[PDB]
Structures are given as C-alpha cells and as structure tokens.
RNA sequence: GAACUGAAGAGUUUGAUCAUGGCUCAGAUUGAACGCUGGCGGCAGGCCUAACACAUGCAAGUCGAGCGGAUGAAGGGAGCUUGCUCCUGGAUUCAGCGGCGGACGGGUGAGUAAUGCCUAGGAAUCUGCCUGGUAGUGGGGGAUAACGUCCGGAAACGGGCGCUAAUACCGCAUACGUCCUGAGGGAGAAAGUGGGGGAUCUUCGGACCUCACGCUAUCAGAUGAGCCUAGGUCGGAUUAGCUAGUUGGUGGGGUAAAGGCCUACCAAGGCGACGAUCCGUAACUGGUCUGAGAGGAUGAUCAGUCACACUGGAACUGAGACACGGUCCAGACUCCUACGGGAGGCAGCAGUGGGGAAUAUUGGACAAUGGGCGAAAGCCUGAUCCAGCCAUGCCGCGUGUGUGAAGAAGGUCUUCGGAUUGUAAAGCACUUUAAGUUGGGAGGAAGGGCAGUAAGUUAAUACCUUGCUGUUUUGACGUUACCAACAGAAUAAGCACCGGCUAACUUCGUGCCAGCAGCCGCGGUAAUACGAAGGGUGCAAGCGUUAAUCGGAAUUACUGGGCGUAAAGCGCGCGUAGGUGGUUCAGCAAGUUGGAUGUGAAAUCCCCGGGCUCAACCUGGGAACUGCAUCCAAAACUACUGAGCUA
C-alpha cells in the first residue's frame, strides 16, 4: 500500500521540514506548522523516552513513505551486514530507484519520482524498471524513457532541484536527462539529525 | 434469526397472557425435503390448551450422532420417517434411555 | 461450562447452539469463557458502531 | 484377483507349485534312505543309497528346487557320517 | 540398475536438473549415490548451461552404470564442447 | 589391526565361558562431573584357565552363542 | 578476504520504606480457527479430529522378432457377365500357452520403549536386470492350454469326453570354471529366434557363413538386502525382584549365512538400585521454533530409515514378498439373488456421509523428467508436469501527481473573540502502473520417420551399428512470459486503540444501572476507563480476538539461586553402597592435551556470488556439522602399580 492523504499534518506532528511539497513558494505559509494537528494543537506535552524513540523511526518512515514491514525487511537487512547497522539503514534508504530519481531531480517530491518509476518512464541500465524498491548499485546510469522527456513536470522540476543545494554525490546531463549514481553518500552528506541510534534502540527492544 | 427472535417474542407474550404449557419435544427426520414440511404442517394443530408439541429440530437424511445427542439434551422423541439410524447414533441410543421410532406413513406418526 | 454474554443485548435461549472462546470473567466466580457474537446463534450486538468486531456487527454503510 | 494378469499369475503358481512338490519329495526321500541306512548301519547299503542319492540332489539344486549351498552341506555331512561308520 | 538420470529442482516453469547416479528403482527426486553435475535449460547471462565431471562420469560408466538417452545426449555434448 | 578390551573376571560359574565387567568414565552431559559407567561382558575360555578377580584381555568375534561375541586373548593378572 | 557481532524492563502486598515472593504485561512464532473488511500478481501450503464407513470413474501392463490358432485386407487375376463366385497369396487385430513386470513408484502413523532409530565398527551371507572376463549353447523323449463333443445352471460359468506347438517340461552326452570328497575318484547345464549372403549339399522347406537379440556354468565389480557388537534414545519406586529353552556345554537337525533358531542329554546358571520386571505414553532422525549463549519445546510440508494395508493366522510363486489394487483359512460388517447360489475391502487420485472450531476439483496431458515392457516403432503411468478452489503464509505493486486561502459549506468545540477538521475539499494542469480492449510474440525440444553419404563387420561395397548431410514431423500448460497501441482519475481502504503500564483527548447521554476489564481497577450527577460524536495514534489488503511454544523468569539457578527470623538443616549418633584424599620418589598412559586419517547423506541455517525488471524464490562454490572411531606424541594434574615419610 501507500499513504495517501494530507501532508502537513505529518510535518506538523513531527514538528519539522520534512520535505512533502514541491518547496515552490515555502512550508511556513500553508499550514501555520507550529502545532501538533488535530484540535489539542496549542499544548506542549512532552513525551517518554519510548515516544522520542517512536518519533524519530516515524519521522524516517515518513520521509521516504516507506510502510513498516519493508522498514522491518530494511532493518534487519542492514543489521546482517557489517559496519555499524546504524548508518547502513540510510545507507540502504538512499538507494532506493524513487530516491534517487528524486535526487536526479526529475521529480518535485518523493511521490512524484515514485509515480514516474511506476508509470514505466524511468530505464536503469537501459532497460525499463518500474518497482520503486530498485537497489541502484554504484556506476548505474538512470535515464528516462525518451518517449517521457518532453514531459512538463521533468522540467519544471530540474530547476527546482537547481535551487535545492548540490547532492554532490549524482551527475545529470540535462540536454539528455541522463545522470550516473557514483556512489551511495556517506553518513555526513546526509542530514546529521536524524538520530538512526533511537530507531537501533527502538528496534533491538 | 429474526424470525425466531419474533416467534419468541410472540411465544413469551402468549404464555405470559394465558400461564403455562406442557411441551411434548420431538426431533424429525425425513427422507425428502416435501415430506418434512408436511410433517410439520399436520403437527401443529395436535395440540391443545394445556398441552403442545414443538418441534426442537429437523432434517433431511438418517439419524446421526448430533441429532440423537440433541434429543437426548432435550427430551425428546426421536421421529425417523423412512429413514435409518447409523452406528453412532444407535450406541447413543442403545446407551440412554432414548426412544427412537421408524415411520414409512405420517399418519402413523400422527396417531403416535 | 458456564460462558458470559457480552454486550448489551442478547437472544439466547433454551437449545440455543453457540460457539464459545477461551476468557475468563474476574467478577464472576467460576466463569472460565467468554460467548462469540454472531457465530452460529447469537446475531451479535444491534446500534453499537465503534468496536463492532468483538461483537459481530456489520459495518453500518 | 481383478486384473487379468493377477489371475495368470495365480494360476501360474498353483502350476508351478504343484510340480515343484513332487520334486521336493524326490530329493527328500533320497536323503532319507542315506539316513535310514546309517542308522542302521548297513555299511554297503549305505554306500548304495549315497551313490544313488547324489545324482539327483545336484540335478535338483542344479534346476533351482533347492540352493546349492544346501546340496553341498548335504553332501558333506552325509559322506562324514559315512567316512565315520566305515572305520 | 545403477543409472545416470535428471533430478528436477527448481521452480514452476523454470526447471534446473541434477545429474544422478541412482539405483533404477528409487524415487525421482529420492536416494542417489553420487550427483556428478548439473544441466541448466534456461541458462542466459552469467549462468552455464550444463556442467560435468569426467572422472566421476567415466568412473561410473565404467563400473556398468547406463544413462538415460537425455543424459546420453549430454555427455557428448559436454565432451564436444 | 584389531581392536581389543581389558577387563576384570566378576563371574566364572559357566562351562567354557566367563563374564568380565569393564569400566569407563564418562562427562555428564550437561553437569560435566566424570561419572563411571560399567559394562559386563561375556567371552569365550575354552580351556577355562581363568578364575574370579583375574584382570584379563578380549576381543570382539563372531557370536558363538546367543549373548555370547568376544573371545579372550590373553591373561595379563592373576587372582591372588 | 567472509562464513557473526551478542544479553533493556514495567505494574501489583504498605500510611510510607527496603526485601522476599507469586501473578500479569511489552517480543518472536503457527498446517490455525473465529469476527469485521477485502484490488492484483509471484512462490509455497491446505482432514492436526474417526487406522470411522464408503456409491461411481480411473491408479499395472507389455511382448506376434517365443508358440499354435482364427480374422484374414491391397492384389495376380480367372470364370460367368459389369453384379457375383472362386484359386492364389496375404497387410492388420488378439481370446489362449509362454517371458518379464506386478516386492517399484504412491498412502498412512495404528502398533512399537526396542528384532525400531542414530553414531561407530565386523563376518559367517545372498543379490534378477547392468559392466568386464573365461568355457560353452550337442543330441532326444513324454505331455498340455487354446480348439471340437455331451451334461448342468436365473446366470456366472462349471464339469466329462479327443486332438495339437514352443525360448513350457523331463531324460542322455559333454565341463575353462564350479560341488563334495583326502590325496583316489565321483557329481552337476543350455533354447532358440530375427536380417542378409559368396561357396558347398538339398524338398535355395533348409543345411552352411556372418550380424544382432537371447540361453547355460563360473570369477570379479557395482547396486540392493540379511546378520552381529559397543554407546545413546520419555514419565513413574504410592512399580523390587524377574527368568526353566531360561543361562552355558556336547552330539545332531535346520538356514543363503553365525546363533537355543530347533531337538536329546549335562550343569544351575543369566538379568537387577549404573533401575531389571511392571504400568502409562510415543514411529525415529536430518531438522523446526524460541533463546546472547547454555538450554527449553517439538518431529506439518521436504529427505533417510521403520511399521502397517477391514480384523486374526498361514504359506505358495518368485532373484527378491509373508505380498497396498495376489492365494488359502477363520471372524465382524454390508450387498446381490430367479432362493438353489456368490461378491466386497479408497491409510492410491478425485469424491460422499459422518465427527469436528477447522483443511480444496468426480479437471488436462503423457509435450518434459522418470518407471514397466519391447528390438524398434510404440503402449501403459492419478508418479510427474500443469491447471481449479481458499488473504492460509511470505514477498512485491496499486487504490493517483503538482498547484491551490474567501483558510468555502457542513460537522465539532468555545472564554462566543475564535479554533479544528484543512491544501484537506472545490477549481486549475498533468500521468496511465495494475485491471479493460486489440495486435505482435520467445523458452521449456532432447528426439522420431525417410534418402544419400563415411567409417567397422565379416568373407563378403549385402543386412546391421555409429558420423554427417537434405526433407518432414512434436507443447497439456496456452488467449504462456513478454512487447506495443487505445480511452479515461475513471475500477480499487479497512481494522484496533486513545486512565497507567503504552503512542494517542475533549464534549454529549447514563447514574453501583446499562456496561467494561490482560493486571491495577472504572460506573452511586460535570466519567479523558461504559455507549455515541468530533479529533488523534498505530498498522494496512489486512486488522483484531481465541488457542499453543519459548523469552522476559537468575521463577529448578551447569553457565546462574538459596536454607538464624521471609519456603527451606533430619531430634541425635553409628555405619553399608557411593563421593572425595596429607607428603616424597619411580613407573604406566585410562582421564587430559596436541597432531594425522576415515566418517559426520542431500536439503536447511551462515558467507561470497549468479539468474527471474526487484523481492520472495531458484541456484554455484565455500564454511559449518561443536560428534564418533583408529593410529602417533607429551607427562604437570587425576586415576592405576611399587617403594617410602610423619604434619
Ligand atoms: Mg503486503
Ligand atoms: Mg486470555
Ligand atoms: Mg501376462
Ligand atoms: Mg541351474
Ligand atoms: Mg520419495
Ligand atoms: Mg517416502
Ligand atoms: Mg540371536
Ligand atoms: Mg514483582
Ligand atoms: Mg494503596
Ligand atoms: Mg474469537
Ligand atoms: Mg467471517
Ligand atoms: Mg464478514
Ligand atoms: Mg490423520
Ligand atoms: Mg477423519
Ligand atoms: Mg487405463
Ligand atoms: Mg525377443
Ligand atoms: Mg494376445
Ligand atoms: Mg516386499
Ligand atoms: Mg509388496
Ligand atoms: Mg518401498
Ligand atoms: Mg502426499
Ligand atoms: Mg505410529
Ligand atoms: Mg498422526
Ligand atoms: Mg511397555
Ligand atoms: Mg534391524
Ligand atoms: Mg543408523
Ligand atoms: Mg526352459
Ligand atoms: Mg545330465
Ligand atoms: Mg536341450
Ligand atoms: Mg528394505
Ligand atoms: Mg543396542
Ligand atoms: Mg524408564
Ligand atoms: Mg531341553
Ligand atoms: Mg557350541
Ligand atoms: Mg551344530
Ligand atoms: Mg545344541
Ligand atoms: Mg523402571
Ligand atoms: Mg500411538
Ligand atoms: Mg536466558
Ligand atoms: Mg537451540
Ligand atoms: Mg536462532
Ligand atoms: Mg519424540
Ligand atoms: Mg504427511
Ligand atoms: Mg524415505
Ligand atoms: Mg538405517
Ligand atoms: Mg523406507
Ligand atoms: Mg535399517
Ligand atoms: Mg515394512
Ligand atoms: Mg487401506
Ligand atoms: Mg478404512
Ligand atoms: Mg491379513
Ligand atoms: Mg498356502
Ligand atoms: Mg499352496
Ligand atoms: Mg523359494
Ligand atoms: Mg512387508
Ligand atoms: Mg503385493
Ligand atoms: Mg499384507
Ligand atoms: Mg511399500
Ligand atoms: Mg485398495
Ligand atoms: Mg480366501
Ligand atoms: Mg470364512
Ligand atoms: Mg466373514
Ligand atoms: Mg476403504
Ligand atoms: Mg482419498
Ligand atoms: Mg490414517
Ligand atoms: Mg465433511
Ligand atoms: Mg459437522
Ligand atoms: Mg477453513
Ligand atoms: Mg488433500
Ligand atoms: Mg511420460
Ligand atoms: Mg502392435
Ligand atoms: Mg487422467
Ligand atoms: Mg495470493
Ligand atoms: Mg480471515
Ligand atoms: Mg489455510
Ligand atoms: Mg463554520
Ligand atoms: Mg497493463
Ligand atoms: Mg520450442
Ligand atoms: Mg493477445
Ligand atoms: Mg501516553
Ligand atoms: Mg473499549
Ligand atoms: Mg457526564
Ligand atoms: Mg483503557
Ligand atoms: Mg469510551
Ligand atoms: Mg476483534
Ligand atoms: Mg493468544
Ligand atoms: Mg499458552
Ligand atoms: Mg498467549
Ligand atoms: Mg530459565
Ligand atoms: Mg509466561
Ligand atoms: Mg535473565
Ligand atoms: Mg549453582
Ligand atoms: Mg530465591
Ligand atoms: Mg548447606
Ligand atoms: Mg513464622
Ligand atoms: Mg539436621
Ligand atoms: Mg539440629
Ligand atoms: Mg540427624
Ligand atoms: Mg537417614
Ligand atoms: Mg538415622
Ligand atoms: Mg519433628
Ligand atoms: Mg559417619
Ligand atoms: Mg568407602
Ligand atoms: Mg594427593
Ligand atoms: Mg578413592
Ligand atoms: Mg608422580
Ligand atoms: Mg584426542
Ligand atoms: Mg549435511
Ligand atoms: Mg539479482
Ligand atoms: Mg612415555
């Protein structure tokens, strides 16, 4: 399945950017994202130690719009491997084919990207992939089908990743909308807040 | 379920007006489906006043091991028109004190 | 064996046929089983609309 | 028997069964004349029926009625019951 | 006898095979003896169509063990290539 | 070659055969302590040169009787 | 270079505290069931209960190149005349004798506590078909099925009377091996078919040569099986004695083979607190699930072994059976009957009734892999390969995407200002995954038939075997996987919970009622705990409840607990089996340690890879299987042996 419905209450109830919208205009300026939704918005209530740590694993969840049972499949995949099972789960979440189209920048948001890998217009190593839970390997290069690339939304959505700061780890030729996936970023490319060693701990419970 | 919902509720109603019922239970058993309906036709107005029978389960086939412990929670007479009773359910018999009889005319059963 | 009704309102009676479920009743002393709405006999709860799977309502609509 | 091949095969064996006893009874006797003798102790009539009585119960192992290792433990035992008789 | 078969793994529509030195009467996929390669039939990419090995196929030929025609057709087939 | 067992003569009242008990120690499965464990054997004399006490030596054969499948082979110590 | 790396606590006894101690909760798992809800696909799974009773179909046949016989086309034609008759031959099919197969493959877990299973070994055996050798396959005889006749029967079919073949059966000769015997010697076999042919003799029916198949004797090898030993294999002492073919010996019998396996004598032995005997329960293992591990629980699916085939016995045939769709005898239970008389065994595949909370189709094909027969085409195959049904499980994907503030209308709450549902909706613009329609389209396929060619085969360009060439021919699944085009947002969200444990709060009804509840406990007029509504939190084609196992439980404590007062030192001695042993030398190598070799099935779990668009799934190699057994070496400690010493 998939979550469908609004996605500013998420925003709000995790209490910070959360990227959900295509990030035109701003995220303060459409849903006052100050209070936790629903009508007991304006009390503090602060939260248990199992609460922070449910907080946080939903919070991950909820940025890449992964349901929990492949969360579970991620989790203990990533402890399997070796080297601190902490950082290997974002190493494995930012692999992900809708992920990395969205890095690419042939999508606003992460739904968008996931629609264009499930509608058949986004080709791995030249062949049409359309599962968005396709483990890119390093080296591969993702291009887009090329009866798809006049479509608008690629391109109004390239200059939105222009101005989103530089991955620096992705290469896109824009003329052909083609880019190569160098290599999975390290753990300081990606933002130093999500805390992985609460959702470790939540786990191992 | 409704039905019976209604028919007990139409049941409490009458008996709380006149008083009280003595009930004669019986099980049937039928061979097919029309005679069974028939049977149950001709004995509901046997009854009387004081006295009435109820039928506390029917059926199409022979006399099994549910039926004969049915009437055996019941106290009832166990009715089998043209059919048989197999293995289990003459031990269940056999074991109590349960009364079993075979019918091939439903008048019989009627004077019965 | 002695089974406890849920619910408010029920339809049991005499030779009434049922299907009973394991639980047991802290008040009552002696009760080790709990009766299953709308199995075989029981036709579960009516008007109730939050919950109603524990006692065998269908969904409103 | 329900399928013809069983009944075939039935009476097949009641055939083969049937000649086989007689063949049976054939090495018996002629082993029991060997004994019967030696119990006696009629030394040159004991020679007689083991003379007599070795041909057929080779050709009857030979033919299968009977498992050569058991027509040469015959034939051992009864030439040592002989061999000993003699002296 | 002692015979060289095909014992069938994988999955539905997609069969993998397992050369098998068995006696005759045995279950398809039961007892064996040895197992002295593999035959792929859909193969494709990095996988190799069919393996042996010659000493143990020479081995038990040998000692009187008697292929299937399939598994006959095989041997040559290795051995050419 | 051929493998052997030593023993000690407990019973010797049967014609041509004798009973030797042998003892092993053996690790507790799960407490870990050595315990001893015995076993009592029947091997074939024929001479009957063996007497109550006598530390002996057998070896493992065909069976010669029912409870009856090792043969000695030769008497290392004698009963005082 | 890897084969692992791993261990949380909380609530509840009191006015409060610390401890002890039980109860309960948070996790992971099912062959699950039930309630509410329900779009698709891939791969698996699916009577755990009555080893209860079974209607109807199918699940084991094949060989005419072993043998008689009867059905005998096409034709050569002839005759009369266009219809028929007949001679000649003869391509097909098989009721019967005969050879193999039916002991496999498939099902179930009743019995079994040891004649089973697991680990490690050994000696006294047999083994059809297969491989390699060696010696052969000579010559005769008597029967019999089928087939004609008579009788009997409701029929099934039975009985009596004559004739005929074989690779059916039985004598005789011969023996590289084989049997026994002592060297001396004696004993024991076979079967012939099909395709060609130069020469020789003939009735070119044939003999004869060759090839192929087959048959006999024997050795070796593989495969399978039988037998023996040691260790291990659930609970109970409120079960302490058991055993007379019983334990050993001799003579004999018997078996493929050792053996009280059997028998006649001789002796009085054998087993047991290291648990015999008896009672209850139970197929075992690889494995599975839990756990940091040590352990605990457990033997669905898959693989190995065992046992069973309505109940109790018994043997025959056979290389192999005490025989799952074979025989005989007896029994219980059904059924047919013309009333005299016979038949039956779904724990094979579908299916029915019944029992149950509960578990599916009277489906397709031998196309693939195997199995039986055949020489070869080929025939059979409910094995198998595939389909049908069921959210039963695991995995994957959909139910749209972006913008959008008059912060619409409505609902809810309110301090009446407003807040919330909420960019959520509407509006505007995009896309068509899956499903729908249409057109293309692999892979599972090796082979078989025919003709020619080249080698070898002999004695021979013949027949035959093999290479190659050319032509033809094969798919249940199947409207395959997959690919492309078309219209449109259209076809597709529910379940539990919100007092603490435990993430999520307010109103309205009701008033110790109705009710809730895993544990504390709520409800008697402002209930965040009952029932609804708004809001929220978890999961999501699922979600909850019930049942069950392990964990947490260090709560049976080996790792890893205790006994003054919380449970817990026998009233006190003596002493048997057992456990343990002051201190020196010397030896031995059972324990101990190290090494080598054999084994520890495959699958499964773990690591590195390879394929299906990913995953589940399949698959290559490795690691592991912590065990057992045999040899070699060491001598600190324990054990054993000899000599000492005095704490
Ligand atoms: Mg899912
Ligand atoms: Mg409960
Ligand atoms: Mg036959
Ligand atoms: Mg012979
Ligand atoms: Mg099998
Ligand atoms: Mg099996
Ligand atoms: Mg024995
Ligand atoms: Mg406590
Ligand atoms: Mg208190
Ligand atoms: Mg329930
Ligand atoms: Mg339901
Ligand atoms: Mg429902
Ligand atoms: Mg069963
Ligand atoms: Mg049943
Ligand atoms: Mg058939
Ligand atoms: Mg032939
Ligand atoms: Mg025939
Ligand atoms: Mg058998
Ligand atoms: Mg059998
Ligand atoms: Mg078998
Ligand atoms: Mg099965
Ligand atoms: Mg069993
Ligand atoms: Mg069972
Ligand atoms: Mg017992
Ligand atoms: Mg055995
Ligand atoms: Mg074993
Ligand atoms: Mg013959
Ligand atoms: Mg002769
Ligand atoms: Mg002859
Ligand atoms: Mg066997
Ligand atoms: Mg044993
Ligand atoms: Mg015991
Ligand atoms: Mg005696
Ligand atoms: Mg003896
Ligand atoms: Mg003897
Ligand atoms: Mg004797
Ligand atoms: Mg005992
Ligand atoms: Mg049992
Ligand atoms: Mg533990
Ligand atoms: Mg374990
Ligand atoms: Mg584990
Ligand atoms: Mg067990
Ligand atoms: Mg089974
Ligand atoms: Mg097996
Ligand atoms: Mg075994
Ligand atoms: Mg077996
Ligand atoms: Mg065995
Ligand atoms: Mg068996
Ligand atoms: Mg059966
Ligand atoms: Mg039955
Ligand atoms: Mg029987
Ligand atoms: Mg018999
Ligand atoms: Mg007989
Ligand atoms: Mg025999
Ligand atoms: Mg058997
Ligand atoms: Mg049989
Ligand atoms: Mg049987
Ligand atoms: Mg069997
Ligand atoms: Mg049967
Ligand atoms: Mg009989
Ligand atoms: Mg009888
Ligand atoms: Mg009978
Ligand atoms: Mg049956
Ligand atoms: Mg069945
Ligand atoms: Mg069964
Ligand atoms: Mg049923
Ligand atoms: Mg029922
Ligand atoms: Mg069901
Ligand atoms: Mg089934
Ligand atoms: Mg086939
Ligand atoms: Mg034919
Ligand atoms: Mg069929
Ligand atoms: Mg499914
Ligand atoms: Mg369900
Ligand atoms: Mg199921
Ligand atoms: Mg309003
Ligand atoms: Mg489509
Ligand atoms: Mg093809
Ligand atoms: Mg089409
Ligand atoms: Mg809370
Ligand atoms: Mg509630
Ligand atoms: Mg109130
Ligand atoms: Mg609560
Ligand atoms: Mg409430
Ligand atoms: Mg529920
Ligand atoms: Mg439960
Ligand atoms: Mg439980
Ligand atoms: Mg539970
Ligand atoms: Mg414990
Ligand atoms: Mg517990
Ligand atoms: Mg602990
Ligand atoms: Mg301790
Ligand atoms: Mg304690
Ligand atoms: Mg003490
Ligand atoms: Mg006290
Ligand atoms: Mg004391
Ligand atoms: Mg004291
Ligand atoms: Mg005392
Ligand atoms: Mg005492
Ligand atoms: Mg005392
Ligand atoms: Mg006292
Ligand atoms: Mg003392
Ligand atoms: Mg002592
Ligand atoms: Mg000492
Ligand atoms: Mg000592
Ligand atoms: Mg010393
Ligand atoms: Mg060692
Ligand atoms: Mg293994
Ligand atoms: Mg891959
Ligand atoms: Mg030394």
């Given at each position: 399945a998939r979550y469908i419905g609004p996605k500013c209450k998420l925003s709000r109830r995790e209490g910070t950017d959360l990227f959900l919208k295509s990030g035109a205009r701003a995220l303060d300026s459409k849903c006052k994202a100050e209070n936790v939704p629903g009508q007991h918005g304006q009390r503090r209530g602060r939260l248990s130690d199992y609460g922070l740590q449910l907080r946080e694993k939903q919070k991950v969840r909820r940025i890449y719009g992964v349901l929990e049972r492949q969360f579970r499949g991620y989790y203990q995949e990533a402890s399997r491997r070796?080297?601190?099972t902490g950082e290997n789960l974002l190493q494995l979440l930012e692999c992900r084919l809708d992920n990395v189209v969205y890095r690419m920048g042939f999508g606003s948001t992460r739904s968008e990207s996931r629609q264009l890998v499930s509608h058949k217009a986004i080709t791995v190593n030249g062949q049409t992939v359309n599962i968005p839970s396709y483990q890119v390997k390093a080296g591969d290069v993702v291009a887009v089908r090329e009866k798809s690339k006049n479509q608008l939304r690629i391109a109004q959505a390239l200059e939105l990743c222009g101005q989103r700061?530089?991955?620096?780890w992705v290469e896109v030729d824009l003329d052909k909308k083609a880019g190569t996936f160098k290599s999975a970023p390290a753990?300081?490319?990606?933002?130093?807040?999500?805390?992985?060693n609460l959702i470790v701990e939540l786990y191992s419970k | 379920l409704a039905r019976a919902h209604a028919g007990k509720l139409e049941n409490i109603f009458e008996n709380m007006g006149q008083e009280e019922k003595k009930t004669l239970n019986i099980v049937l058993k039928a061979d097919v489906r029309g005679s069974l309906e028939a049977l149950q036709g001709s004995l509901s107005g046997l009854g009387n006043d004081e006295v009435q029978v109820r039928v506390v389960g029917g059926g199409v086939g022979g006399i099994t091991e549910s039926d004969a412990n049915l009437a055996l929670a019941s106290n009832a007479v166990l009715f089998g028109f043209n059919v048989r009773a197999d293995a289990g359910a003459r031990k269940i018999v056999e074991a109590e004190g349960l009364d079993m009889r075979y019918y091939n005319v439903i008048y019989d059963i009627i004077e019965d | 064996v002695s089974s406890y009704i849920g619910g408010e309102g029920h339809n049991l009676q005499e030779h009434s046929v049922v299907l009973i479920r394991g639980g047991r009743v802290k008040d009552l002393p002696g009760v080790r089983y709990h009766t299953v709405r709308?199995?075989?006999?029981?036709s579960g709860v009516k008007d109730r609309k939050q919950g109603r799977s524990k006692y065998g309502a269908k969904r409103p609509k | 028997a329900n399928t013809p091949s069983a009944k075939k095969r039935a009476k097949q064996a009641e055939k083969r069964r049937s000649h086989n006893a007689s063949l049976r009874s054939m090495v018996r006797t002629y082993i029991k004349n060997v004994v019967k003798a030696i119990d006696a102790k009629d030394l040159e009539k004991a020679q007689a029926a083991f003379t007599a009585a070795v041909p057929v119960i080779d050709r009857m192992a030979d033919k299968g009625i009977i498992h050569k290792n058991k027509a040469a433990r015959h034939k051992s035992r009864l030439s040592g019951h002989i061999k000993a008789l003699s002296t | 006898m002692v015979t060289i078969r095909l014992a069938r793994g994988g999955s539905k529509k997609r069969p993998f095979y397992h050369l098998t030195v068995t006696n005759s009467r045995n279950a398809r996929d039961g007892r064996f003896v040895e197992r002295i390669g593999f035959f792929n039939?859909?193969?494709?990419?990095?996988?190799?169509?069919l393996s042996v090995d010659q000493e143990r196929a020479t081995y038990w030929l040998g000692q009187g063990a008697q292929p299937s025609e399939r598994v006959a057709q095989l041997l040559k087939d290795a051995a050419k290539a | 070659t051929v493998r052997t067992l030593t023993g000690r003569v407990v019973s010797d009242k049967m014609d041509k055969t004798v009973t030797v008990l042998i003892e092993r120690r053996v690790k507790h499965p799960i407490y870990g302590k050595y315990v001893k464990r015995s076993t009592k054997l029947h091997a074939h004399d024929e001479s009957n040169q063996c007497r109550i006490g006598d530390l002996v030596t057998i070896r493992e054969t065909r069976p010669?009787?029912?409870?009856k499948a090792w043969t000695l082979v030769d008497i290392v110590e004698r009963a005082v």
């Open positions: 070796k080297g601190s700061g530089r991955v620096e753990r300081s490319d990606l933002s130093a807040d999500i805390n992985e | - | 709308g199995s075989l006999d029981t | - | 039939p859909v193969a494709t990419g990095g996988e190799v169509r | 010669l009787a029912k409870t």
